[PDB]
Symmetry: D2
Subunit: 258 residues, 4 copies
Amino acid sequence: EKFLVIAGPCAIESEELLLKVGEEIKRLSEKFKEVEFVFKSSFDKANRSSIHSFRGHGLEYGVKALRKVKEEFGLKITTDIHESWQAEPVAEVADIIQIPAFLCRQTDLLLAAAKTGRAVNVKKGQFLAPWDTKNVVEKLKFGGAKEIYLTERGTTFGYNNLVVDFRSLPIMKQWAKVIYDATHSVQLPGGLGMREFIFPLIRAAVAVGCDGVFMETHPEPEKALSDASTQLPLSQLEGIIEAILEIREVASKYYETI
Amino acid sequence: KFLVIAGPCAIESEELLLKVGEEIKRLSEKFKEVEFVFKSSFDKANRSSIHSFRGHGLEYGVKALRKVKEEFGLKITTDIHESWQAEPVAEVADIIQIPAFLCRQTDLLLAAAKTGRAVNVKKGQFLAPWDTKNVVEKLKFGGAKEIYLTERGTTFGYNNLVVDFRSLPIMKQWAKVIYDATHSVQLPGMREFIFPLIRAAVAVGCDGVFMETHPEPEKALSDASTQLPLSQLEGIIEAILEIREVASKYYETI
Amino acid sequence: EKFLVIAGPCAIESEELLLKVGEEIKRLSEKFKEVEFVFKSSFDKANRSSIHSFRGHGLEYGVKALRKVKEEFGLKITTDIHESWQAEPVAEVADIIQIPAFLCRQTDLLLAAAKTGRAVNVKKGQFLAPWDTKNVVEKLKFGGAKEIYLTERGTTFGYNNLVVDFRSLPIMKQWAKVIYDATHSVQLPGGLGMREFIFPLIRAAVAVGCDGVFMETHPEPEKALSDASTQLPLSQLEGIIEAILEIREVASKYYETI
Amino acid sequence: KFLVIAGPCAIESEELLLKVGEEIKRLSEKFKEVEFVFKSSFDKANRSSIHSFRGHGLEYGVKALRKVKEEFGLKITTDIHESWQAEPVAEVADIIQIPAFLCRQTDLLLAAAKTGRAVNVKKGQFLAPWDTKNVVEKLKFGGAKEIYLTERGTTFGYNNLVVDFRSLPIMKQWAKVIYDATHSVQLPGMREFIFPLIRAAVAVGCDGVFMETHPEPEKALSDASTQLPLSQLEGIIEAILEIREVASKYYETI
Ligand SMILES: O=P(O)(O)OC[C@@H](O)[C@@H](O)[C@H](O)CO
Ligand SMILES: O=P(O)(O)OC[C@@H](O)[C@@H](O)[C@H](O)CO
């Protein structure tokens, strides 16, 4: 099956930033034809720790910006919603509606996404056990979703630290397609993220076996308005993708059947 | 004075609320050294299963809660799940409760603070004690003045929560601290640990306790494995007041 | 039942240090007649993180030092063993033989302690669940122990941090007398301990209900050769003990029956 | 070259060791790019229950291990539990293994290093990756030169272990890192996760893998729920070599 790579800048800092990243993603999509790319960026960071941190430029602006990417590059789009009313307007441009990790159990949000007819990707709550995502998929299927994704993004391990229990990939694979979040799984919740572990954990994810990877990328991570410690420099994206396809290929014959 | 927030988990019917309201009203008359707050949810917006009881809706709920406040003169508190609910709920709720999973949702916190009512934030199972300083800052920025932080356990492996009582003194630096005696022992819950841990909460030091109670916990449509039997409420309250009276002499300053 | 207070300097820095602490413990034992005191100190810190840290002056020296305390003050004695051969010689002076937390599952060490006829106190491993101590008691009873204690000293919570799950006290009470370690439960494993939490957690322990408390105390913690961040200043011991007896008394009528 | 440490959990009989030794000897001939080490414990000194199988003693064990090294010319490794055992065990064991619970016992580490043999320390379930730097220092101080640190999971709530693969690159700064594929999935263990995680171990990067194997894992007197079936060993080895060959191009330096 075609491997999914969901990538893009964490936040929609500007339509310019999006075009620059989309251009590179478009180029890579032409090179890695066996990969299905999906451009990602949030119109709002509705859960920042601090009230003084960057949130965004509003839903209206973001959807317009994302639509420009899809139009100019012909790329699939995904972004996250935070309250039920946002699903409808977002569904106009988003091919995949993303459900934030903290909100993975909010019934109305999941139902709002499911009825749009779009694909839904739920980030696994840092508080949720692998086997507890079964009910999450049941809610989505009940709400009309026909294409569902579950994203591994780490689990609460003591304070201000997350650990990735890779046993979760085959467990979740039982009821949904699984995506590995390479950049948020190494972040330190309220710490201020460890970038040196992004690549190795990604290798692990593909050797274990998943249906795709989620990576936040920015031309200059050091200048990002969000996740400046975890976003991957855009120049490194090509090499990372090439590496996971290679590892995925050689490990593929050993993937267990669910 | 010491705060005691109690009531049934979900508004199963205004009937149920009135019955519990009666008992809470009685205790209220018996323990003048305690500020009682009637609590109940108009919607269980985060059940694990789509096939579980959620409730009768916001209007039926705000209605029944109005009936309790008017028939017993008790303060009220219930939780909101989306920004638009803050305003209508603030009509009856003296304290607006923010769900644990939603403690980082900026707009929800701001919407709550905007109503001018008191705000109680359940500490997320993913949050470290010191991470709550930022939750309070948001509320203050939003105009909130009476702010509460509730301890309800922290993620400890899978399907288990642990109470790190170091959290009470830490959170107290920036807000009044409430201990959730019923949800802190639930397994994402042995009722046998409810009383022992509430005793610890008061020996350590907190500004109030949160307890879900029901005439017949087993028949409850929600948290049936942890809701405290109504008849046991008085006994526990008297016990925590006695322990608090003695232990308060040693509560550390700030 | 008579409340147990196990206290003393972490390590046997010198026989002088022991006499100074024992003198104060002896004085307190005369004041708090409803308490059963047991003087504690280790002749060896066999599990320090660093090879350059203080271990002790040997078994021979320590046993002699402890015997001096028991002789000069008439106090019960307890110290920990690290290998089977030490039980016999230690049993000569120790009323209670202590089993280190990391060694709570070493069968021969437990059996070695049990056959001396002395009381045995096992520090609960930071890796052990409350209900798993049942087998630990079974091993001791099998080995001849007739007076067994289980000590709560925290559980691994992420890296370099321990949390105390107070549900463990009533659980362990089902098969042994339970002791709460007030000073090691707030230490940060390999961190360099948070002294400001010692007192509040002790209040919690007695309000929940336990059969005794374990506290390391030193005249000048800042100068200790071990646990300088967790040892309680000897001047504060009297007040702490008075406080727990008061809290224990008022909470006592509510202790659940096992 | 890549290290593969394998054998039955406990020395149930020199008979069992010889059978497994035969298969390991065969793989040894088939995979020259791999250094195989035969492993088995003469004593299970830390069983939870007093009524569980421990073994046949140190002499019967060191004897049977001698038979394997002499009949197949394989390197040997077994674990010690008290200082006095280092010397007699060093007679046959090429690598002395230090139990996870005992990774902080200074005298045991020193006793092992004193023999002059290689030393493999199982990382305690209570230890953080960076805390192993001190474990190595002790060994070096004791005269050890060939030092190994084995990843075997970390305490995650109760009765569960999680593998934080960030530990492999961290521990590599001061020692050769081995991944314990069988004990890392055991619940203080679904065999279904053994292969997937070993694949991750090699994709991430390690110097060898540790695997307990038995002709009939179910009949094993120890770790019966996690011991890998002897027949599946070859397949897994070939798989990790292939993955390693491809992934090694991306292993980070130091
Ligand atoms: O405000 P801070 O704590 O930096 O958090 C931001 C990240 O957690 C955020 O971008 C993420 O995708 C949402 O949780
Ligand atoms: O060597 P460090 O890490 O300071 O450790 C010492 C304490 O953990 C020690 O005194 C304790 O009683 C034994 O584990």
